[PDB]
Amino acid sequence: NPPPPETSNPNKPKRQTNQLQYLLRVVLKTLWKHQFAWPFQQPVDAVKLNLPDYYKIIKTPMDMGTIKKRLENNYYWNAQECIQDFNTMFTNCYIYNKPGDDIVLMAEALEKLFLQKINELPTE
Numbered sequence: 643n644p645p646p647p648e649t650s651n652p653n654k655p656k657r658q659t660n661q662l663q664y665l666l667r668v669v670l671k672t673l674w675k676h677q678f679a680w681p682f683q684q685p686v687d688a689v690k691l692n693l694p695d696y697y698k699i700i701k702t703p704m705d706m707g708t709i710k711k712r713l714e715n716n717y718y719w720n721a722q723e724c725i726q727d728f729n730t731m732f733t734n735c736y737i738y739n740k741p742g743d744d745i746v747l748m749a750e751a752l753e754k755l756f757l758q759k760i761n762e763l764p765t766e
């Protein structure tokens with residue numbers, strides 16, 4: 643297992659935004675409470691899951707556990723940076739797995755929920 647994605651950067655000035663607050667308050671909390679959140683609340687444990695090829699195949703690993711920390715650490719520069727991490731997290735799941743897999747069906751539901759909630763976003 644690699645080290646997790648960084649959750650802070652001393653050279654990146656901390657920053658907070660109306661949308662970044664909404665993404666932590668509204669968007670992240672919804673998916674984190676969702677029944678399908680559990681495979682995404684932390685980085686993929688390739689060791690525990692016996693996935694030797696994962697971190698060779700998945701070049702940009704991302705998870706909601708990382709996203710939660712970054713929103714709480716004001717690591718994100720703007721909402722768009724947080725949004726892309728969510729999409730990257732779903733994409734990794736989609737490409738690494740096979741069609742019909744349960745983890746795909748769950749990621750679909752979580753992604754439709756993610757998109758439904760960011761239609762309700764301010765502007766910045």
Ligand SMILES: Cc1sc2c(c1C)C(c1ccc(Cl)cc1)=N[C@@H](CC(=O)NCCOCCOCCNC(=O)C[C@@H]1N=C(c3ccc(Cl)cc3)c3c(sc(C)c3C)-n3c(C)nnc31)c1nnc(C)n1-2
Nearest residue numbers: 680681682685686687691692693694734735738739744745
């Ligand atoms: C004694 C033997 S016999 C034997 C072997 C040996 C040693 C060998 C072998 C290998 C190397 C060497 Cl040198 C020598 C031998 N190889 C095996 C076969 C082999 O190569 N295995 C390793 C490759 O496995 C890849 C396929 O993995 C399928 C499962 N996918 C996942 O886990 C993805 C993962 N899913 C879920 C998930 C799933 C379902 C649900 Cl509802 C929800 C989530 C998930 C997350 S996070 C999380 C916390 C979970 C639970 N998650 C995310 C996010 N995104 N994705 C995932 C083999 N083949 N023929 C023979 C004979 N052998």
